[PDB]
Amino acid sequence: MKQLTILGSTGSIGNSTLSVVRANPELFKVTALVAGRNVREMAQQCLEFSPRYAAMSDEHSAKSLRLLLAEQGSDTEVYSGETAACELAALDDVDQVMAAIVGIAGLPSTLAAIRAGKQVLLANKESLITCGKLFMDEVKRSRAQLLPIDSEHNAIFQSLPERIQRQLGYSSLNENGVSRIILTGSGGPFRETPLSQFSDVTPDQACAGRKISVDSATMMNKGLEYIEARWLFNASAEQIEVVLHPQSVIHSMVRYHDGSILAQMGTPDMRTPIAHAMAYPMRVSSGVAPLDFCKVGALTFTTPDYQRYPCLKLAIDACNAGQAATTALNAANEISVMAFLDSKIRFTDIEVINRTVVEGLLLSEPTSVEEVLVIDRKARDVAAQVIAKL
């Protein structure tokens, strides 16, 4: 049966993943567990799932965890640091690796797994927003099998032909029958709000994560998912479109050459795409009532409008210009968001900041993690500046 390393096990995706394991003890076996500094959640996982190894980001968290398990007499071996996380993402006997360590701290361990030809269930985003090129190159080299976990990408993946699914990110969409990918998204809260009221939007009105809420209103969440999808499904600009779909019943679609469209639907539960990806090409259960069609309201769709969602276009143009542009935009969006979250700026200022930073770009494309981290820090700064200067 199947052997797992779970990178980022103590957090939200980490735990849904373990839940799929808890409900299919016969199919999935936990070999390695990695997390940051949550000893307590890590110990209780290590006792329940009895891995061979575990790692924490630093030595102090390791020492703690090592003691707690030593009191319970578990055999689990405990390590620390980026190298250990990399070596647990690369063990020869592990079949499947969950890359669910958030943010740019996650990239190293994700890459090791990609490098070891593993089935990698990709939860980390930055990977592709900032250095999709390096990652997808590595994927080709290793014939590593990527499986997206985000519901939208997962939707696409299920909607894609097996042919492409098994060669994810280096199959040629056109040759294999695909005309276009349809990334769907709701519009956020301000979808039928009159543009006059955009300038006056506030944090409480946006958020009632905190930051994901803002992104979904500007549709930065969908711009970034668009970039992710270009690298991920090996898709050019003409091969992917975005449609608005307020009810979010349909998680995404795929257009084929004869006209056929294949879409995935479901409720929005975590486990469902996580287990799709874990069992693939099998399938298992997970609790949640199947969708009911008498319950769901009507479904509607629109093309998004760039006057309402300028950030989207921005994301698209940034992709077309390169990894420097996206890296920059991502980082400057993180600054803009938590600036509007502190009321330093208006909601409509987010585009302007995001745009200025990106149109003052004059760097080379990054060819590693390292060069990314540089661009990420400088864009932050420039953005940081831009906030102040109005």
Using CB under 6 A as the criterion, which residues of the chain lie in contact with ligand NDP when the complex forms? 8-14, 34-38, 57, 85, 100-102, 105-106, 123-125, 149-150, 270
Query: Of ligand NDP, its own copies, none, which one sits near residue 38, judging by CB under 5 to 8 A according to partner kind?
Result: ligand NDP
CA distance 329 to 314: 8
In Å, how far from its chain's centre is CA 177?
26
φ/ψ of residue 51, rounded to 5: -75, 170
Binding residues for NADPH: 10-13, 36-38, 124, 126, 209
Inter-axis angle of helices 39-49 and 59-71, nearest 10: 40
> Which lies closer to its own copies via its Cβ, residue 20 or residue 54?
20
Q: How many residues bind its own copies (CB under 8 A)?
A: 51
Residue selected from 293, 370, 388, 389 as contacting its own copies according to rule CB under 8 A = 293
Residue selected from 3, 193, 267, 348 as contacting its own copies according to rule CB under 8 A = 267
In the bound complex, what is the minimum distance in angstroms from residue 267's beta carbon to its own copies? 6
By CB under 8 A, is residue 19 in contact with its own copies?
Answer: no
- What is residue 163's three-state secondary structure? helix
Structure tokens belonging to residue 157 = 């993946």
Query: Of ligand NDP, its own copies, none, which one sits near residue 102, judging by CB under 5 to 8 A according to partner kind?
Result: ligand NDP
In the bound complex, what is the minimum distance in angstroms from residue 11's beta carbon to ligand NDP? 2
In the bound complex, what is the minimum distance in angstroms from residue 57's beta carbon to its own copies? 31
CA distances (Å), origin 174, targets 28, 65, 89, 97, 155: 35, 50, 33, 29, 19
The residues, ordered by sequence, that sit 6+ positions from 196 with a Cβ below 8 Å of its Cβ are: none
Binding residues for Mn(2+): 150, 152, 225
CB 218 within 8 A of CB 207: no
Residue selected from 26, 92, 93, 162 as contacting its own copies according to rule CB under 8 A = 162
In the bound complex, what is the minimum distance in angstroms from residue 14's beta carbon to its own copies? 18
In the bound complex, what is the minimum distance in angstroms from residue 206's beta carbon to ligand NDP? 19
Exposed e or buried b for every residue in 15-45, given b needs 16+ CB within 10 A? bbbbbbbeebeeebbbbbbbbbebbeebbeb
Binding residues: 10-13, 36-38, 124-126, 150-152, 186, 209, 216, 221-222, 225
Q: What is the dihedral of CA 109, 114, 119, 122, to 10 degrees?
A: 60
Binding residues for 1-deoxy-D-xylulose 5-phosphate: 125, 151-152, 186, 216, 221-222, 225
In the bound complex, what is the minimum distance in angstroms from residue 122's beta carbon to ligand NDP? 8
In the bound complex, what is the minimum distance in angstroms from residue 386's beta carbon to ligand NDP? 25
Region of 4-12, 93-101, 228-236, 272-280 interacting with its own copies (CB under 8 A): 272-280
The owner of tokens 């590693």 is: 368
CA distance 29 to 10: 17
In the bound complex, what is the minimum distance in angstroms from residue 120's beta carbon to ligand NDP? 13
Exposed e or buried b for every residue in 126-160, given b needs 16+ CB within 10 A? bbbbbbbebbbebbeebebbbbbbbbbbbbbbbbb
By CB under 8 A, is residue 172 in contact with its own copies?
Answer: no
Region of 32-40, 133-141, 262-270, 305-313 interacting with its own copies (CB under 8 A): 262-270
Region of 44-52, 255-263, 312-320, 336-344 interacting with its own copies (CB under 8 A): 255-263
Inter-axis angle of helices 369-388 and 323-340, nearest 10: 40
Region of 61-69, 230-238, 253-261, 332-340 interacting with its own copies (CB under 8 A): 253-261
CA distance 244 to 229: 17
CA distance 231 to 243: 19
By CB under 8 A, is residue 261 in contact with its own copies?
Answer: yes
- What is residue 378's three-state secondary structure? helix
Binding residues (CB under 8 A) for its own copies: these are 158-159, 161-163, 176-179, 243, 253, 255-267, 269, 271-273, 275-276, 279, 281-286, 288-291, 293-294, 296-303
